[PDB]
Design a protein around this ligand. Structure first.
Ligand SMILES: Nc1ncnc2c1ncn2[C@@H]1O[C@H](COP(=O)(O)OP(=O)(O)O)[C@@H](O)[C@H]1O
Ligand code: ALF
Ligand SMILES: [Zn+2]
Length: 683
RNA sequence: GUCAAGCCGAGGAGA
RNA sequence: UCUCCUCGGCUUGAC
């Protein structure tokens, strides 16, 4: 029951036979269908050729793999060929390399494949080789770039093509290369002011893929334009003259502390540059071993955060955020006391805070000066849903997660949204961060299905949503004051697959966001022109340029290796001393340390044992200092109750000359630690 | 079916 | 070089 459209056939017509190429079309144009048709066509040809038919599909996003398998690939081609869909969530009970020769149609996230190849290179596993496949297919190719995943693969394929070309003039024998396909919407630009630079960027993309041409549709192009609708754009701006009662109270607190510090930011409060200054000051303070400065740097940073959320989010959210933090600090102090101890700074800060904290709590619940951009957002939602009369499938984007969760709660709480019957759910990535609850991959998938069901007419999400999530109908899409690049803008702007679609943006009049909007708009215009230039490029000249770029990429890789051969070759097990960071309290040396899984660094001596504290919530306990610094988390490996930690929380002190430093992660530093022989700790 | 923790890589933004 | 955010992956464990 497979189908096709005219332009679809037109654009793909070359690839139907050889011609490893790219395809560039607007969103929701049946790209997936194009791929599917090509898969079937490709295999049928291999079968009639009595030749092996293997295919593989690649998606950067995990959600996307399931999507394609669920809705497009598995349905049509189920009967003819075997199919299967893999992801981190999926369990490869078999293995990757085996199924490569089992289901004959693979769908996978990228890094899975690369992981397999890399293992093959190591010899640790049988792994897999490109030759095993006959056709490699890709989505969102635009990602292919400097150190992008896809690029890691292509650089291999390119290398082999170069070998094949070398043989072409030396020896008849060669190694087969699978046909490569490319599927995207906006190949994008590398922030090129000049369209010629953009042209170059494209050429780089194509060469990173052995694209013989962009091959965008021209003849039926009008038909496609007619078929496909573009949302009615809409800008929404809001100036923040309010927040004087509450925000200003905060700025007052910040200044009070800075006065406690005698440190001049020379930067506006609530800004990243201000935050960055806080960090470097904190780093310097800690490296110096000095206090009263790094600690305050920490708190101020917390407050700049609180400001930025208070800018977007209401006073309540930020106040709560500060309150949680200080609550944690108090609990640490109490655990330490559990003896007698006193502090001057912390006492200054907590007595500075707790009372003003009550004040801000009182100031927190105010509807009038709650926000401006949030309100505008409400107005847009309420208007559109009221206007749709049950015909609204809504999406939202932001930058962070804490944002998403807050919005979903506040929207559900708001009677106005409740009145219209809108239902809000927040979506995020699997990993846990930003002090938010992680979502199980299944939970995300469930949520997606519920929206596809319409159970949720308003799904909050993050960049993860910007891609894929092919939905039959969506009328509404917005952006909550977030500008990253033209590509993200267009993909998101191309997600309301409805005859009538609305694109909205919400920005502070003060922030130069609409600026960047216009930027990306120009880039969008620039690229289509650049594409038209190359499409008219000479084949041979095109060929020469791409070859040059292919080589360039590879040699670049070689040097990035050369500077990475070792680049920090210290075999110095214990030539150091780790102190606490808040307090300059010695903790351990390098010798008392060992490793498990060659990943986790730990010490397991009673000397380190009788120093920390376990703050409760129960198995995975958290660790803290006697100063109140947090140190690490418990760990139960093979029964051993080893407490593991994070290097970032501690500070370096060499034996030689003590140029104290921070590394933020173990791998960065040169020296090695050993694994732990469990011969120890026996009877 | 549930949860936690940790490590690594990559991209984007800003500086 | 630093920072923030985001994504992907790999391990350990417990329930
Ligand atoms: N032959 C066809 N005729 C009509 N509609 C089609 C055809 N093939 C695909 N589509 C439509 O295209 C949509 C899928 O678009 P897709 O290519 O996945 O989005 P994108 O191009 O942004 O990745 C489906 O909802 C389907 O309705
Ligand atoms: F391939 Al698309 F939006 F164009 F997922
Ligand atoms: Zn300490």
């Amino acid at each position: 029951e497979l189908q096709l459209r005219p332009y679809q056939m037109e654009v793909a017509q070359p690839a139907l036979d050889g011609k490893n190429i790219i395809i560039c079309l607007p969103t929701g144009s049946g790209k997936t269908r194009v791929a599917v048709y090509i898969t079937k066509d490709h295999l049928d040809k291999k079968k009639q050729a009595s030749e092996s038919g293997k295919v593989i599909v690649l998606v950067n996003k995990v959600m996307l793999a399931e999507q394609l398998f669920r809705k497009e690939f598995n349905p049509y081609l189920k009967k003819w060929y075997r199919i299967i869909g893999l992801s981190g969530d999926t369990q490869l009970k078999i293995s990757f390399p085996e199924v490569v020769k089992s289901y004959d149609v693979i769908i996978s996230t990228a890094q899975i494949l690369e992981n397999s190849l890399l293992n093959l290179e190591s010899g640790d596993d049988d792994g897999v080789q490109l030759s095993d496949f006959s056709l490699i297919i890709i989505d969102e190719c635009h990602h292919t770039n400097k150190e992008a995943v896809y690029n890691n693969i292509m650089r291999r394929y390119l290398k082999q093509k170069l070998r094949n070309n070398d043989l072409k003039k030396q020896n008849k024998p060669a190694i087969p290369l699978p046909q490569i396909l490319g599927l995207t919407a906006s190949p994008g630009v590398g922030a090129a002011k000049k369209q010629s630079e953009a042209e170059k960027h494209i050429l780089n993309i194509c060469a990173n893929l052995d694209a013989f041409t962009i091959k965008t549709v021209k003849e039926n192009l009008g038909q496609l334009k007619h078929q496909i609708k573009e949302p009615c754009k809409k800008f929404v701006i809001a100036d923040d003259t309010r927040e004087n009662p509450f925000k200003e109270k905060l700025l007052e607190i910040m200044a009070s502390i800075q006065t406690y510090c005698q440190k001049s930011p020379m930067s506006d409060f609530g800004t990243q540059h201000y935050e960055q200054w806080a960090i470097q000051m904190e780093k310097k303070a800690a490296k110096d071993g000095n206090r009263k400065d790094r600690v305050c740097a920490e708190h101020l940073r917390k407050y700049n955060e609180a400001l930025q959320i208070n800018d977007t989010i209401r006073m309540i959210d930020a106040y709560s955020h500060l309150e949680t933090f200080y609550t944690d600090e108090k609990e640490k102090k109490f655990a330490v006391l559990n003896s007698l101890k006193l502090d001057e700074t912390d006492e200054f800060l907590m007595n500075l805070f707790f009372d003003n904290k009550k004040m801000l709590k009182k100031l927190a619940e105010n509807p009038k000066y709650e926000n401006e951009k949030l309100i505008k957002l409400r107005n847009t939602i309420l208007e559109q849903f009221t206007r749709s009369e049950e015909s609204s499938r809504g999406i939202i984007f932001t930058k962070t997660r804490q944002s998403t969760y807050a919005l979903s709660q506040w929207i559900m709480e708001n009677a106005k949204f409740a009145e219209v019957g809108v239902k809000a759910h927040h979506l995020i990535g699997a990993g846990h961060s930003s002090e938010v609850k992680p979502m199980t991959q299944t939970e995300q998938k469930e949520v997606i299905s519920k929206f596809r069901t319409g159970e949720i007419n308003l799904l909050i999400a993050t960049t993860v949503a910007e891609e894929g999530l092919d939905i039959k109908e969506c009328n509404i899409v917005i952006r909550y004051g977030l500008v990253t690049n033209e590509i993200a803008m267009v993909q998101a702007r191309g997600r309301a697959r409805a005859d009538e679609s609305t694109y909205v943006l919400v920005t502070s009049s003060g922030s130069g966001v609409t600026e960047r909007e216009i930027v990306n708009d120009f880039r969008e215009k620039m690229k289509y022109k650049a594409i038209n230039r190359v499409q008219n490029m000479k084949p041979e000249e095109y060929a020469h340029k791409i070859l040059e770029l292919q080589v360039q990429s590879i040699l670049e890789k070689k040097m990035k290796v050369k500077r990475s051969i070792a680049k920090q070759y210290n075999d110095n097990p214990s030539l150091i001393t780790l102190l606490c960071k808040n307090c300059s309290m010695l903790v351990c040396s390098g010798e008392n340390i060992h490793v498990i899984e060659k990943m986790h660094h730990v010490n397991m001596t009673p000397e380190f044992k009788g120093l920390y504290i376990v703050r409760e919530n129960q198995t995975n306990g958290e660790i803290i200092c006697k100063c109140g610094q947090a140190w690490g988390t418990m760990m139960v490996h093979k029964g051993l109750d080893l407490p593991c930690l994070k290097i970032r929380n501690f500070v370096v002190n060499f034996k030689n000359n003590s140029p104290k430093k921070q590394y933020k992660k173990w791998v960065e530093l040169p020296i090695r630690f050993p694994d732990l022989d469990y011969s120890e700790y026996c009877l």
